[PDB]
Amino acid sequence: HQKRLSAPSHWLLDKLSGAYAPRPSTGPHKLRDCMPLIVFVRNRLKYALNYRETKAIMMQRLVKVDGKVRTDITYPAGFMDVITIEKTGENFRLIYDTKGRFTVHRITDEEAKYKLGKVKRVQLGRGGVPFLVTHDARTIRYPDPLIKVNDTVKIDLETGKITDFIKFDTGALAMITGGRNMGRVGVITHRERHDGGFGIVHLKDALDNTFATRESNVFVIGSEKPWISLPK
Amino acid sequence: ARQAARSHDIKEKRLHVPLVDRLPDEPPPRLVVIVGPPGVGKTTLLKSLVRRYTKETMSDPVGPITVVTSKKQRLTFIECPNELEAMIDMAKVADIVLLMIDGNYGFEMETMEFLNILANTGMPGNVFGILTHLDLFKKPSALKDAKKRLKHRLWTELYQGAHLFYLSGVLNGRYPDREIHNLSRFLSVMKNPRPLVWRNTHPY
Amino acid sequence: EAARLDSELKLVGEYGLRNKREVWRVLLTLSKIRRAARILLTLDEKDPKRLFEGNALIRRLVRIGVLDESRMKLDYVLALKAEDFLERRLQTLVYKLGLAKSIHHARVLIRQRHIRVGKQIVNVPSFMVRLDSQKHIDFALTSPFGGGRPGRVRRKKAK
Amino acid sequence: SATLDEFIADEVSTAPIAEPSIGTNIVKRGRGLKTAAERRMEEERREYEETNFVRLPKESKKERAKRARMEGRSGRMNFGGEEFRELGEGAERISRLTKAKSSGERYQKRLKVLESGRGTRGK
RNA sequence: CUAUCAACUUUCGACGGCUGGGUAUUGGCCAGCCGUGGUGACAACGGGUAAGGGUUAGGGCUCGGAGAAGGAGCCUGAGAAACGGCUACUACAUCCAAGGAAGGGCAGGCGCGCAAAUUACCCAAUCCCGACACGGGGAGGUAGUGACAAUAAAUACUGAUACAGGGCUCUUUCGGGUCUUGUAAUUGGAAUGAGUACAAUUUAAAUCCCUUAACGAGGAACAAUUGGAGGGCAAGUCUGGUGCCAGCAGCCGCGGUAAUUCCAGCUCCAAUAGCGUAUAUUGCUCGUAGUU
RNA sequence: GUUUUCAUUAAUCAGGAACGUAAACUAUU
Numbered sequence A: 001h002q003k004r005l006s007a008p009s010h011w012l013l014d015k016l017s018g019a020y021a022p023r024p025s026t027g028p029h030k031l032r033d034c035m036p037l038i039v040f041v042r043n044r045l046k047y048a049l050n051y052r053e054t055k056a057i058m059m060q061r062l063v064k065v066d067g068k069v070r071t072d073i074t075y076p077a078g079f080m081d082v083i084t085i086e087k088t089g090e091n092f093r094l095i096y097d098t099k100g101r102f103t104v105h106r107i108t109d110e111e112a113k114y115k116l117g118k119v120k121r122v123q124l125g126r127g128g129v130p131f132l133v134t135h136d137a138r139t140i141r142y143p144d145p146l147i148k149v150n151d152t153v154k155i156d157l158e159t160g161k162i163t164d165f166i167k168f169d170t171g172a173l174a175m176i177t178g179g180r181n182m183g184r185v186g187v188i189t190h191r192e193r194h195d196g197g198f199g200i201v202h203l204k205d206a207l208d209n210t211f212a213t214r215e216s217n218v219f220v221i222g223s224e225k226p227w228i229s230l231p232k
Numbered sequence B: 001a002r003q004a005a006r007s008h009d010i011k012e013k014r015l016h017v018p019l020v021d022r023l024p025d026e027p028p029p030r031l032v033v034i035v036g037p038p039g040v041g042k043t044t045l046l047k048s049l050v051r052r053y054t055k056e057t058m059s060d061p062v063g064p065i066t067v068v069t070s071k072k073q074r075l076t077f078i079e080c081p082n083e084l085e086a087m088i089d090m091a092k093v094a095d096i097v098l099l100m101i102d103g104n105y106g107f108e109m110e111t112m113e114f115l116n117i118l119a120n121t122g123m124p125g126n127v128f129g130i131l132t133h134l135d136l137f138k139k140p141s142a143l144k145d146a147k148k149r150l151k152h153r154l155w156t157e158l159y160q161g162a163h164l165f166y167l168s169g170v171l172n173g174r175y176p177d178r179e180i181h182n183l184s185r186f187l188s189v190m191k192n193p194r195p196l197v198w199r200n201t202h203p204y
Numbered sequence C: 001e002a003a004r005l006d007s008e009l010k011l012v013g014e015y016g017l018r019n020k021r022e023v024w025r026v027l028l029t030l031s032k033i034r035r036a037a038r039i040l041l042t043l044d045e046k047d048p049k050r051l052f053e054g055n056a057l058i059r060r061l062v063r064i065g066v067l068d069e070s071r072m073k074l075d076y077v078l079a080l081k082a083e084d085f086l087e088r089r090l091q092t093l094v095y096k097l098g099l100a101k102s103i104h105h106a107r108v109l110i111r112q113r114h115i116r117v118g119k120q121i122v123n124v125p126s127f128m129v130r131l132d133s134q135k136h137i138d139f140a141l142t143s144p145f146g147g148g149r150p151g152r153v154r155r156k157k158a159k
Numbered sequence D: 001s002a003t004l005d006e007f008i009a010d011e012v013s014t015a016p017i018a019e020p021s022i023g024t025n026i027v028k029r030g031r032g033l034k035t036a037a038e039r040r041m042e043e044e045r046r047e048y049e050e051t052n053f054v055r056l057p058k059e060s061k062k063e064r065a066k067r068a069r070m071e072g073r074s075g076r077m078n079f080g081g082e083e084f085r086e087l088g089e090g091a092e093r094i095s096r097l098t099k100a101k102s103s104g105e106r107y108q109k110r111l112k113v114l115e116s117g118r119g120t121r122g123k
Numbered sequence E: 001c002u003a004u005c006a007a008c009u010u011u012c013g014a015c016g017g018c019u020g021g022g023u024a025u026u027g028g029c030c031a032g033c034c035g036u037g038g039u040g041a042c043a044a045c046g047g048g049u050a051a052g053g054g055u056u057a058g059g060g061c062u063c064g065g066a067g068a069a070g071g072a073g074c075c076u077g078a079g080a081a082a083c084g085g086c087u088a089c090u091a092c093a094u095c096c097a098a099g100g101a102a103g104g105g106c107a108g109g110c111g112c113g114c115a116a117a118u119u120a121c122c123c124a125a126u127c128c129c130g131a132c133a134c135g136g137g138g139a140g141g142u143a144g145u146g147a148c149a150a151u152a153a154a155u156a157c158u159g160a161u162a163c164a165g166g167g168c169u170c171u172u173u174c175g176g177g178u179c180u181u182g183u184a185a186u187u188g189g190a191a192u193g194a195g196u197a198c199a200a201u202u203u204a205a206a207u208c209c210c211u212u213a214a215c216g217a218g219g220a221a222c223a224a225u226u227g228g229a230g231g232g233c234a235a236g237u238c239u240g241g242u243g244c245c246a247g248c249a250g251c252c253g254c255g256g257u258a259a260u261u262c263c264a265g266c267u268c269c270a271a272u273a274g275c276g277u278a279u280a281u282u283g284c285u286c287g288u289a290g291u292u
Numbered sequence F: 001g002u003u004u005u006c007a008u009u010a011a012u013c014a015g016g017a018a019c020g021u022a023a024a025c026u027a028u029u
C-alpha cells in the first residue's frame, strides 16, 4: 500500500494513478527489482483502464508469463520475462534502458521461445545430484558441468532445459542491473577479485567510458551475439 | 502581553448582574415550547420527539408532555396553538423555545411576533430555530440560498451564531430519525435556566 | 492629503474607475516593477545579472505593451507610471477603439458581455490587454451589435 | 536559469516558437491569463485524458491547499500574460553560470627618408 | 552542552576461559569451577532535557518508546509476551424471583446565567484481505458552512427638446477672477445580469462548472452601507435679565392617524461591499582580586 | 645638579589598612 513516490523510479507512474501504488506480490523476482503485471498491462502498455478491467483480463486465460498462465494481478515479473498475449499475438520482453528504467520490447515466437537467465548458484542437491539456480529462481536438475556462477543460460521455456551458456569473461559484453551506474550496456574488460567480500569488475561501453561495477550487479548478455533483441 | 489582553477581555465577558437563582434541588421539568405559524408541523415535531424519547406513538398529543431525558433533568413539551393569547401566555412561561420556520415560504409574522414578544417579556436561555419543509424544493442551489438567507435573518433577529436545524422530509408521517436525534442531542444536555426576575419572584 | 485626493480623483475620472482600491492596486504593481528596476540599476553595467534580468524586464514590459518600443532603457522603466498602466487596461482600450461612446459606456459593455478579446468574451474591465492582443477587441457574435438575435428590448418591442 | 532559457529561445536559437491564438489562454471570462508555464501544464493534464480516457476530478481540496500556498511563499506575480520573477536567488544563478563559462618593409622607408637631402624649411 | 561531575564497574556478573542449560541460533544470556579484572582527563561516569536521514539549481518530496481497570501466570499462530481471550487476587459497576449471572473503548455537548465550522454521501476511482472475477474495508475521494483573510465587480448607458440666467473661485472680501451651467422639466432609444428556469450533461447518486430554449428594469424600484461636519423650523418647552435680547435645545404644536404629502426625498467631506468605536500601543593616602 | 646605578620593575582601583557647633549669596591651549 505504498505511495506513488515511494514506488521505485524504474517502473514509471505518472500523475494519474492516484496517490497510491500497488505492491508486487511475493514471487521469483525481488521487490525493488520488479514490474507487477498490473503496471505492465494498464500503466505501461495501457491495454486496460481500471483494476477491475485488469482483473477481467487476468482471470480468463489470456495472459501467459514465462510460458505459463499467471492469474493473480500483482505477480512479479522483474527481468526478461517473456509475456505472451495470444489474442493480440504479441510477446513482450523486459530489458532496461541507458537511464535506468524498464523497457518493453515487442517480439514474435522465435525470440520469444527462450530465456537468457543468469546463474545464481550451483550445488549438490538431494539424491547426490548437481542442480542449478538462476535469478528467476529456476532450478535445473543435472546441468552442463561447466556452467558455474555468473554464467548465463538459454532456457528452453517449453521444457525448461539448458540449450546454451555464456561464460563470465573479460571481453564479453554485459548489462548492468544495479548500483549507481545502473543500466549501461558495455563490455567487461577487467575484473578485480577483492577476496574478503564485494569484488568488482571494470567495464567500458562501446564509446570509452570506464567504470567499476560489482560482480553481483553485472549480468552477462553476450560477447557480440545479441541473443535477445535490444531495441534499435 | 496579548495573552493577558485576551484573558482580560474574556474575564470581562464572563460577567453579568448577580441575580438570584431560585432553583430547587429536585427541579421541575423544563418547559419546551413548539412555536410557529399555522401549518408548519408543530404537532408532527411533538410526535417525533416523544417517539424519540419514550418510544410511544401518540396519535393525537395534546397538553404538556413530561419526559425523562436524563437521570437529573427532565423536559416537558407544550405546543403553542396558533392564537396570540396562547403565544403571549406561554412566552413568559417557556424555558427553552423551538421556533419553527417554514422553509421555502420564508419567515412569517407569527414567528417574528413571538420572537419580539419573548424578547420584550423575558429572554430564556435556549431558543433553537427549526427550519422545516425543505423537501418542497426543486433546485438544491435555491435550497442552500434559502438556508443561508433564513439563517442570517434569524441571526439578526435573536443573536449571532444561533442553532438552526434543518428537518428535511416526512417519511412515516413523523420525521427523519437522524435529524431529530441530533436535535435531541442539542436539547438533551442542558444548563441551568437564566435567572429571570419574574419567574424568580412569582410562583407559577 | 489633498494632493493624494486630487491625484486619485484625476485617475478615477480620467479613466472610468470605480473606487480608489483599483488605483492603489495599480500603484502597488507599478511600485513592484519600479523597485525591480531600481535594484537592477544598483549593479554596474555589463554585469550578467543586470544584463539578462534587465533584458527580461524590458522585453516583458514591451510585450505587455506598457513601455514603448522606442525607449528600451532601465531608466525609462524607472520613469514608468500608473497612467500608462490604466491606459493599458481593457476598458479604456474599448473607449479609445471607439466601440463605446464614453468610458462608463465601455465599462457597461464589458460587464454585460458584448466585447470579446480574441476568441473568448471578457467579463472583467480591468483585463490587462497586451500589445499583440490589442487589435482583436470587437463585439461578440452573440451580441446584438455583433449579430444573432436582435435582443431584449427589441424583442419586447417587436412582439 | 529561468531568465537565461528564454533568452536562447527568442534571441539566439533560430526556431519559431508556437504562439496561441489570442483568445485561447483566457481562463474564466478574463479573470486570469494563462502564463506560458501554466498553459504547458494544461496540455499535460489534457494529453493524459486520451491515453486511457478516464476522466479526472478537477483538482481537489488537498492539491488546492498546496498550490495556492505556493503563491504565499513566492515573489512571483502575473501582471499580464507574462510572469514577473523576483530578483532574489534567480538572479544570482545568471552570475553563477557565466563564471564557469568564462573558466622587412620598415627599414626601406627609413633609408628612403635618409637619402633625399630635405624637402624645404619652415614655410 | 557541561568538570559546582574524577573516578566508575565488581551493589541483578564486573572482564575472561572451561563445562552444560535454555533459545530458532551465537553470546555471562543463565547455572557450577577457577583466574584478576574492565573503563577513565585522547574525556569514562554523572548531571542538564530543550528527543534528524535520503532525494542535491531551489523549494518541495520521502522515511523515522510505554498501555489497553492494576500487578501475577497461561493459550493460538510462520510471525504477538496479541491484550484478542482465560484463572486467581485487588478495585468499580449491572440484572434478579435474593439461590445466582454477565461486564470493563473512543467520539459529542456543557464546562457562567450569554451562544458562533456537518451528528452529510459513497467504495465510484488508487489500495488491501479472503475457498475466491461477485464477498468484505473508518485509508481515500465527493458534498455542506465561512466578511478571518484573499480574488474579480453589479446597483445603470446614451440622445433630443423646452425653460431658466447664473454657475464657480480667491491672496487681500462691502473687493477682485472666469465663462456656459442647471431643472423634482417633457420625451425617446437601446443594453441587460442577479433572479426565475425547460432540458441535456457532470457524477457511485447528486451538486458545482461548461453548454442552454423561455421569461427577467423605470425609482412608489430587483430598495448600499458606514462614519464625520454644517445650515434651515413652531400660536411648543426650559433657563438667564436694568423691554423686542441671548443660550440650551426642539419626534412633544390648535385640530387630526386614512389625518397628513411636508427641506418632499437639506448641504458638504471620506471610505465604499465594506466601515466605525474602545484599550494596548508602535575627608585624603597606601593597597589586593581585576583592567590597560 | 651629577662625570650615579638594577632595566620593567610600572598606571588604575573590587576587598582592606593609616591618619580626622556647623551651613547661610555663589596632547596642547
Ligand SMILES: Nc1nc2c(ncn2[C@@H]2O[C@H](COP(=O)(O)OP(=O)(O)OP(=O)(O)O)[C@@H](O)[C@H]2O)c(=O)[nH]1
Pocket: B037, B038, B039, B040, B041, B042, B043, B044, B045, B081, B082, B132, B133, B134, B135, B136, B167, B168, B169, B170, B173
Ligand atoms: N414535505 C413536508 N411536509 C411537512 C413537513 N412538516 C410537516 N409537513 C406536513 O404538513 C402538515 C402539517 O401538519 P402539522 O405539522 O400537524 O401542522 P401543525 O401546525 O404542526 O399543527 P396545527 O398547528 O394543528 O396545524 C402535515 O400533514 C405534514 O405531513 C416537512 O418538513 N416537509
Ligand SMILES: [Mg+2]
Pocket: B042, B043, B079, B080, B081
Ligand atoms: Mg399542535
